[PDB]
Design a protein around this ligand. Sequence first.
Ligand SMILES: NCCCC[C@H](NC(=O)CCC(=O)O)C(=O)O
Ligand SMILES: NCCCC[C@H](NC(=O)CCC(=O)O)C(=O)O
Ligand SMILES: NCCCC[C@H](NC(=O)CCC(=O)O)C(=O)O
Ligand SMILES: NCCCC[C@H](NC(=O)CCC(=O)O)C(=O)O
Ligand SMILES: [Mg+2]
Ligand SMILES: [Mg+2]
Ligand SMILES: [Mg+2]
Ligand SMILES: [Mg+2]
Lengths: 369, 369, 369, 369
Amino acid sequence: MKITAIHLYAIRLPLRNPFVISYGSYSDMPSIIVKMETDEGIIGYGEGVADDHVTGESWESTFHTLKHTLTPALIGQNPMNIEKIHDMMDNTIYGVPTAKAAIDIACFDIMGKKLNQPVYQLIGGRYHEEFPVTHVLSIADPENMAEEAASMIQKGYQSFKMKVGTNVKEDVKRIEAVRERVGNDIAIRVDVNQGWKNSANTLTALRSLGHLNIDWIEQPVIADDIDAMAHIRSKTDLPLMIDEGLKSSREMRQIIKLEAADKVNIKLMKCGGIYPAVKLAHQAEMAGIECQVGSMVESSVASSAGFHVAFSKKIITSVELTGPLKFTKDIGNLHYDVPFIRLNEKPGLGIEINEDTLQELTVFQDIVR
Amino acid sequence: MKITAIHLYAIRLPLRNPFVISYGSYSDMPSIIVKMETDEGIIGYGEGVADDHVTGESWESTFHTLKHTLTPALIGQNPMNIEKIHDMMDNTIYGVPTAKAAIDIACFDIMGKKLNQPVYQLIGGRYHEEFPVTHVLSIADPENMAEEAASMIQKGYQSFKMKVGTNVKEDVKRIEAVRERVGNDIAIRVDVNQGWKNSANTLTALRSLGHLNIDWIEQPVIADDIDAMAHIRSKTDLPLMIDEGLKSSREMRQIIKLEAADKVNIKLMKCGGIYPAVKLAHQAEMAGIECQVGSMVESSVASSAGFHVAFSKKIITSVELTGPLKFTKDIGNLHYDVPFIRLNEKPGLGIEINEDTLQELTVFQDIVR
Amino acid sequence: MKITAIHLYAIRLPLRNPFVISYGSYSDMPSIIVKMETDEGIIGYGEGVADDHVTGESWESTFHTLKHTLTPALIGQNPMNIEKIHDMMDNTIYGVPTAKAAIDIACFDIMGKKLNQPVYQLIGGRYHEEFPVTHVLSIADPENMAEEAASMIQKGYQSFKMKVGTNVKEDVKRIEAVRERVGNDIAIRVDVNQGWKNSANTLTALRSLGHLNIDWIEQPVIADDIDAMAHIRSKTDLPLMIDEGLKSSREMRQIIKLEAADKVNIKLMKCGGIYPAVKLAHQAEMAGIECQVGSMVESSVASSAGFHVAFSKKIITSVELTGPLKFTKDIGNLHYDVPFIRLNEKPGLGIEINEDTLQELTVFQDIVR
Amino acid sequence: MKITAIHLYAIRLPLRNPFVISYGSYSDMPSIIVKMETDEGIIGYGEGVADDHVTGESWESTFHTLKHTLTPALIGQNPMNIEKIHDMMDNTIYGVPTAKAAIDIACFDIMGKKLNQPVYQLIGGRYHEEFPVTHVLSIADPENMAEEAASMIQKGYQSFKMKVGTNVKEDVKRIEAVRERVGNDIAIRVDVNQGWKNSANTLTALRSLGHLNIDWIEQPVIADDIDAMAHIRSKTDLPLMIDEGLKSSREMRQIIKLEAADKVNIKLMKCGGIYPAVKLAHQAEMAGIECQVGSMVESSVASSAGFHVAFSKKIITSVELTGPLKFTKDIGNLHYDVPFIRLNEKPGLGIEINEDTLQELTVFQDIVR
Ligand SMILES: NCCCC[C@H](NC(=O)CCC(=O)O)C(=O)O
Ligand SMILES: NCCCC[C@H](NC(=O)CCC(=O)O)C(=O)O
Ligand SMILES: NCCCC[C@H](NC(=O)CCC(=O)O)C(=O)O
Ligand SMILES: NCCCC[C@H](NC(=O)CCC(=O)O)C(=O)O
Ligand SMILES: [Mg+2]
Ligand SMILES: [Mg+2]
Ligand SMILES: [Mg+2]
Ligand SMILES: [Mg+2]
């Protein structure tokens, strides 16, 4: 099998409501779509949703990295040899996990369609039957966050992820409000997106959250400070998750060496795709670190890819890919059974791409041969 | 797909010459063969070559562990869901990597035959085109070891693994003899199989091997002493490999934490098969530890499985599976191109099993339904 | 003062001869030039030479990161407030040091021209009067490297940097050849550009270089492995320098914590410009780590900026910016007095930009207002 | 530019009320003023307020160190080359940060006046717009401290620094009294000035301060014991600041290595001036340690210099320079907008020196040419 052409689509996914977190507000979600063609007629779809604040990659930079740097060398290569494909991309350019992920996902889609098997059957098989879906609440005034939670509870949601990180006192008030409104039978996890910056602010914040039954605190400090995460962990009994601070095996090695976390948020966009994500899961398993497969808020394409990894591993105990539930328009048709997510048994990513929607959301594109 | 039956064959592979190492001498190699049948008619072959001195598993103990403990629960399960199969086996019984490997290998053979792809294409794809083959020299008097090396050099061999470990002074004489006979353009690695026992004896031995150009020293101390390996590594510049001291991710975690090795000998019989072997490779990669896929001296079945793992990973830089070259009779037909090993592109393990040879070597058997 | 417009020029600097190192060969050097205009008429020039293999930034990706992400927010900002400018860029996007450097350099050029002072007078003043210039020898056969060295010695060079990293045995032969040809009164430093990959290969290589009087060994292992650098340092007495393994203060923190290096190669393209480079120098000084200001092979623009940092700090004891000596065409006119480099006392970067040459080398451009 | 003469003035700044802390009581504040003249007519003012208990420098010792040791070598040197000036002073004499600071500040005043820019524009530019001003309460009976706080609250103060450190039980009573009187919307930080001496006394004290909402505890133990600070930090969740224990980069290195503090009080008088202070800020930033620029209670001269550093760095989040608010007479005219401090945009330190006041407060003086 040989790659004959790679279509690149710079699209923008419309959000029902702006997604607001500690480091930024998103009115919509720019994404790069990959359509990989082969000499055998088998097509594969990939996606790269870049988050400037996490990996230093942007919508436009990713489009061009793919067009001028990554894809040229890929023409003629076999999508089935994923280890080789990744070695070639890594030898060509360091980092750029989001760009590499777009390629990796398309290769797996092709592999599954070629072998007529779901992607999860190719990376360990099916392990999970379903996962609960967690609703992510954007930053807002305490009462506003509490009201949205109540509203989503009527929709069937039983697990929430609270976005905080602007001011410790205010963040504590936000969390108290939500917990008070939903009761103690609703799951709540808190994501600071680096907002508390250091261990002192974090430990002070944690002093007021012990009685609120928080499942875990995610990335309270600046990404680069793994040392601070380990220090906080030595002084609190609340589970800690690292997100922005974990991208590749480089950071996983440090997290393990320093005992810096109880959980890690593995994301295809941070490590380079399905293949690197599986390696990270295997590394975390060695150290008994629980894993979650999150996302940058992606379309059905990358979201499906993430689930295929999650459903194939026992060490992955939670998932956070809800882009399709946030967008008013999607190029794929990944189906959710809120409050649960299950995967069908169709080939590859197991979804269908609406060509009309794809072109409708495309701002600019190119084809590399 | 469902497993309908599992045939267990207790066989004995005949050796041209006894294989002699530090901890024992083998006149032949007892092995357990697995023939897995499915409701779809697809058959898979697995193999478990137990080494009592390494994993505490024996020929007979493995046969019975498979018959009474592992296989019963496997009937009805899907061989394609390898993560699930391993979780079930692990939940049933701790350890017994050789017994689990026999099952794991058969599952992959079935997966490849079902998808009409070589096993390596299912665990990362093809990365390597070939590997040099290293001839293992059994322990013997210095001149006798040097003569066999000269003899094998005429056969095309250009890489040798010297078995030593009975007495430091004598082991040094053995190594000096071989190097002196073959010249400095021949690769030589030394395997002590725990023979020097501790760091003091090892460091004393290493003082006399600096000018002999040894590629690496393998397992100089007792298996359980990872601390000693790290101590030796802090005081020598000769590459160190751990074998018996590494079985599962439990020891890999320690090796990484303590910086105890430059290389590790990963073996399907020590970790439970292809799936666990891949996880170990991923873990080693994180820490920059070079990997080799060795063996316990196995038939074409397990030897092929080992190569499928090796050929799919960049981190695996050497291989040591030469059972087929040591036996006067083999149940499989794995082909070697001494001094090289290449893999064909046939489905599954890519080999053919000679039913007549299998029954000829069988001492006792059973079928579990 | 306010930034009114930023011109972006995607150019390609022609090389007299291809520059060849362990990870790649360069026929020419693609660069992004920044021309910053202000409401006061003061113009500033910046430059971003991206090295895909070091920071995950490319020629095209950098052009677009600047055009769509970094520059828009900069319009209206005061170039004089460098701390603020960097905070804004960092809040906008993580990483992308090369893109940020192009902006930072232009700001300093404007600051110096506005205050009518050389850049070095604005970041500590002049400390050094001159620095010796080291000729970088691209990878080639031992005799070919030795001959080029002899040739450059006639040109006045008395210090050489040998590029190696393809094979330990061959690299040792290259180094032996050069030292043997130039004698022992010529300075030689060796740069492996990650070629030896790990500590085992590195320590083996170092065993044969003790009698060759090598000033220091630069980046022998893969960039991400700071642990390996510390391990090598614990077992050798040859000075060690980290290059690709050091980009931002994140890695400097690890290098200091782990005692991983004797020297570090600080580069504007790896940390984001003059301002971040000064911070890194201050951090290294605290731990007694010697610093060198290297480069990615840049035009007079970025090369001058690098020297301005070097000449202002006692902790910076060597420099490696020779792009202007390697290109057959340059947009700036930085003057070298081989075997020495001195800086004039003109405002800003102290050089003149040839508009005709700039346009001649431009492949594509844009202006952001 | 060349230094032509340096005037040294030994003055005494009158205090409205005696300043009382754990290690001493001050009826007034002896200070050394520096008036630096240049061949260009540009004059610069510097100041050295020695605290015998912190750096081992005294009013008289500093006057003489400047007159006989530091200034002679400075005559003829260029004030613009600060890195060089500091290297010369350091090569001449180790330590004496207060004496060196007096020189460093005058050089920066000249640099800013020469380039017609505020000092902050020369060391990173303006980052902050304003800082809240914290009123320092001298040690006194609990009720007396509580009353002064109430009184200053009417003056507009909303942040207080409580001086304690004579007896744990009594110090706790002092803190309880003040918090009870001002309510919970007033910021309070506690400075023990080494009064609790060790970790046992400190941890016992902290047991009773958890419910009083203290922003941070400053220097509870003896200066030289960084180990004790790290031990306390491992057993408390109250933010810890080091003051007397931090002088030069020597102690910063230890603080970072041992994770001994959440915050550090950087002072020009402890490190040698503006230039060394900036280096310390850069070092702290690497480790995520928050910085504050404090003072020894200085005139507008040194106080202004301190603010210029603070206003130029994001890592500096608080300031403590209130000498001008404590003295009944000042030689400079630094303006405060209680409860805030803002900096004008005038050249150099941006203040005016009253020659009449200077001579009025001078006890003895000299001129070095
Ligand atoms: N690129 C937009 C910001 C994504 C933030 C990121 N993702 C989410 O919070 C939502 C993930 C999901 O439910 O898909 C995170 O975990 O921080
Ligand atoms: N079970 C018999 C002893 C096997 C010893 C084991 N294997 C070998 O030495 C030979 C491996 C091979 O070439 O297949 C080892 O590496 O120590
Ligand atoms: N981007 C092209 C590769 C640059 C390699 C880089 N620079 C040099 O070797 C030459 C630096 C100089 O002399 O300017 C390094 O130190 O490794
Ligand atoms: N030299 C007299 C003692 C100064 C004590 C020193 N400074 C202060 O407490 C007041 C600082 C200020 O507000 O200027 C400290 O922080 O301990
Ligand atoms: Mg997150
Ligand atoms: Mg062995
Ligand atoms: Mg280099
Ligand atoms: Mg203090």
